[PDB]
């Protein structure tokens, strides 16, 4: 089995900078006819992939000349000298020879300064509480890098169950991310505790960002 | 002029089989290899298999051997794929793309893709919940909406019929036991709300549902 090990999986870049996506085969992919069938595709969010480079270093027709391929041994490289806002998305290498294998992906994204999440906890709505349910939502807005962690607590007691998180993609305006955790309980179960905490630990402070409330209000 | 059209969005119950089409045009169907690629909800691209029409040769990924059945009908210029014994892992987007011969030798044309959802879920309108900040007592005030327990995707959520858009953070829907859950955060200056009405308009087309939820205190 041939393995296309593509790195890195995430490459934040500042506009106008040169990007370098690498892709390595677990052994030579040079075919019998002497040809190397190593292409590069880019899948922009919401659309299908599209051919960029074919035969290792050849640019497909209509492809921005800032794109270029190369690659020898088992190491191939995609370069985007001068990254524009249209180049952002997921890049894939692909050895379409023997058993066609895709690289893993390298999400081209924008780089900005680190930024701490801005947390906000919301108690269950009375209407949800009428149906017998009770979600406690925590928005962890506008941060960077995207790497963030959330721990819930009930009466100081950690609660790892029924918590459904969901992250937004990099914000187009400020290049930040936002996450959304949600502890869903039962009305009765909810109505048997006071303190509902959610602590966001991000790359910025070594101290979790705590957000709490008491049904005592 | 080469055009790859694929069948629509299919919602399949688990354990079933799903047959999808891919109508080619603008080129000789029988002279090129049609490839199929799978993309699970969150991961990269996976090569499934390939058929050469007009001789019906096939080549599968070991993983898909008994799972994906590639066929082609030259009089319909349509490649087909039947994914059977449907599991959760079969929920993904499927692309039929063409392997060009001379010039490029690569997947230069792709279809818009086919979205298959494997679930036992029945069609369910959402439950839209207002998320007012905790209790009484900064410069900006974060509000939100919780849209949960719906089937199937998608839903559309706007803030104030759309007047509010900056500061809005709509997070990706996630399935938590047969149904979907989506949430949205709207950050507006203190002097805007409650001084101003901030309604959350949720539409679930599959259920012919348009719901407004005004965020009161």
- Cβ–Cβ contact B66 with A under 8 A: no
Contacts of A123 in chain B (CB under 8 A): 134
For strands A106-110 and A10-13, give the pairing: parallel
**Under 8 Å between Cβ of A51 and A117:** no
How was this entry determined? X-ray
Search chain A and give the residue with CA nearest B213. A127
Contact: B132, A55; criterion CB under 8 Å:
no
Q: Taking CB atoms and an 8 Å cut-off, how many pairs form between chains A and B?
A: 137
DSSP calls for chain A? ---EEEE-SEEEE-TTSPEEEEEEESS--B-TTS-B-EEEEEE-TTS---EEEETTTEEPTT--TTEE--B-SSEEEEEESS--TTS-SEEEEEE-SSS-EE---EEEEE----B--EEEEEPPPHHHHHTTEEEEEEEEEEEBSS-EEEEEEETTEE--SSB---B----TTT--EEEEEEEEEEHHHHTT--BEEEEEEESS-SS-EEE--BS--
Residue A93, token pair as written in the block: 């290498």
| DSSP structural state of residue B123 | P
CATH of B121-216, one of 2.60.120.10, 2.60.40.10, 2.40.128.20, 3.30.365.10: 2.60.40.10
Question: How far B140 CA sits from the closest chain A CA (Å)?
Answer: 11
CA torsion sign for B126, A158, A114, A118 is positive
| DSSP structural state of residue B41 | S
Resolution in A: 2.4
Q: Is the peptide bond before A69 cis (omega within 30 degrees of 0)?
A: no
CA torsion sign for B6, B8, B10, B16 is negative
> Nearest 5°: CA angle at B34, between B82 and B108?
135
- What CATH superfamily classification does A1-112 receive? Immunoglobulins (2.60.40.10)
Query: How many angstroms separate the CA atoms of A4 and A16, rounded?
Result: 28
Domain A114-213 belongs in CATH node 2.40.33.20: no
Strand partners, B109: B98
Contacts of B178 in chain A (CB under 8 A): none
Contact: B131, A125; criterion CB under 8 Å:
yes
In 3D space, the residue among B111, B94, B93, B113 whose CA is nearest the CA of residue B4 turns out to be: B111
**Under 8 Å between Cβ of B200 and B156:** no
| DSSP structural state of residue B31 | G
142-161 in B: which are within 8 Å (CB) of A? 142, 144, 146, 148
Alpha helices in chain B (DSSP H): none
> CA torsion A179→B146→A129→A194, rounded to 10°?
20
- Cβ–Cβ contact B187 with A under 8 A: yes
Q: Which of A131, A139, A166 lies at the smallest CB-CB distance from B127? A: A131
Strand partners, A190: none
**Under 8 Å between Cβ of B188 and B195:** no
What residue spans define the domains of chain A?
A: 1-112, 114-213
**Under 8 Å between Cβ of A106 and A6:** yes
Q: Which of B45, B99, B135 lies at the smallest CB-CB distance from A96? A: B99
Question: B1-120 architecture in CATH?
Answer: Sandwich (2.60)
Strand partners, B158: B201
- Cβ–Cβ contact B174 with A under 8 A: yes
Query: How many angstroms separate the CA atoms of B194 and B199, rounded?
Result: 11
Query: How many angstroms separate the CA atoms of B203 and B201, rounded?
Result: 7
- Cβ–Cβ contact B127 with A under 8 A: yes
Question: How far B85 CA sits from the closest chain A CA (Å)?
Answer: 24
Give CATH 2.60.40.10 domain extents, chain B.
1-120, 121-216
DSSP calls for B65-110? TTTEEEEEETTTTEEEEEE-S--GGG-EEEEEEEE--TTT-SEEEE
Contacts of B187 in chain A (CB under 8 A): 141
In 3D space, the residue among A191, A60, A70 whose CA is nearest the CA of residue A124 turns out to be: A191
Contact: A178, B134; criterion CB under 8 Å:
no
Could you give the 3-state DSSP secondary structure of residue B22?
A: strand
Same fold flag, A1-112 and A114-213:
yes
Scan for tokens 């719901």, then name that residue: B211
Contacts of A196 in chain B (CB under 8 A): none
**Under 8 Å between Cβ of B187 and B133:** no
């Amino acid at each position: 089995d041939v393995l296309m090990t593509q790195t890195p999986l995430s490459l934040p870049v500042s506009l106008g900078d040169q990007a370098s996506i690498s892709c390595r085969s677990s052994q030579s992919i040079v075919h019998s006819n002497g040809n190397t069938y190593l292409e590069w595709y880019l899948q922009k969010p919401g659309q299908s992939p599209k051919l960029l480079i074919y035969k290792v270093s050849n640019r497909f027709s209509g492809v921005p000349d800032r794109f270029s391929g190369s690659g020898s041994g088992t190491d191939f490289t995609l370069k985007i000298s001068r990254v524009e806002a249209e180049d952002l998305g997921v890049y894939y290498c692909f050895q379409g020879s023997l058993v066609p294998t895709f690289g893993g992906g390298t999400k081209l994204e924008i780089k900005r300064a680190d930024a701490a999440p801005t947390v906000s906890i919301f108690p269950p709505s009375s209407e949800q509480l009428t149906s017998g349910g009770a979600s406690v939502v925590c928005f962890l807005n506008n941060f960077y890098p995207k790497d963030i962690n959330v721990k819930w607590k009930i009466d100081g007691s950690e609660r790892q169950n029924g918590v459904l998180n969901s992250w937004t993609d990099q914000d187009s305006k400020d290049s930040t991310y936002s996450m959304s955790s949600t502890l869903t309980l039962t009305k009765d179960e909810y109505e048997r505790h006071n303190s509902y905490t959610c602590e966001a630990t991000h790359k910025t402070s070594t101290s979790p960002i705590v957000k709490s409330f008491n049904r005592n209000e | 002029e080469v055009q790859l059209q694929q069948s629509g969005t299919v919602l399949a119950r688990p354990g079933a089989s799903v047959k999808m089409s891919c109508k080619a045009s603008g080129y000789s169907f029988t002279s090129f290899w049609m490839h199929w690629v799978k993309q699970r909800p969150g991961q990269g691209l996976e090569w499934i298999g390939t058929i050469y029409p007009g001789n019906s040769d096939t080549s599968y990924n070991q993983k898909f051997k008994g799972k994906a059945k590639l066929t082609a009908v030259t009089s319909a210029s349509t490649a087909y794929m039947e994914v059977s014994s449907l599991t959760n892992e079969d929920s993904a987007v499927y692309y039929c793309t063409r392997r060009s011969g001379y010039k490029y030798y690569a997947l230069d044309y792709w279809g818009q893709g086919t979205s298959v959802t494997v679930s036992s879920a029945k069609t369910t309108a959402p439950s839209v919940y207002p998320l007012a900040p905790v209790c009484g007592d900064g410069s900006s005030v974060t509000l939100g909406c919780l849209v949960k327990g719906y089937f199937p995707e998608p839903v559309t959520l706007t803030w104030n019929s759309g007047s509010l858009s900056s500061g809005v953070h709509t997070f990706p829907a996630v399935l938590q036991s047969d149904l979907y859950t989506l949430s949205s955060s709207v950050t507006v200056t203190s002097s805007t709300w409650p001084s101003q009405s901030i309604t959350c308009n949720v539409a679930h087309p599959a259920s012919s549902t348009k719901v407004d939820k005004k965020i009161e205190p």
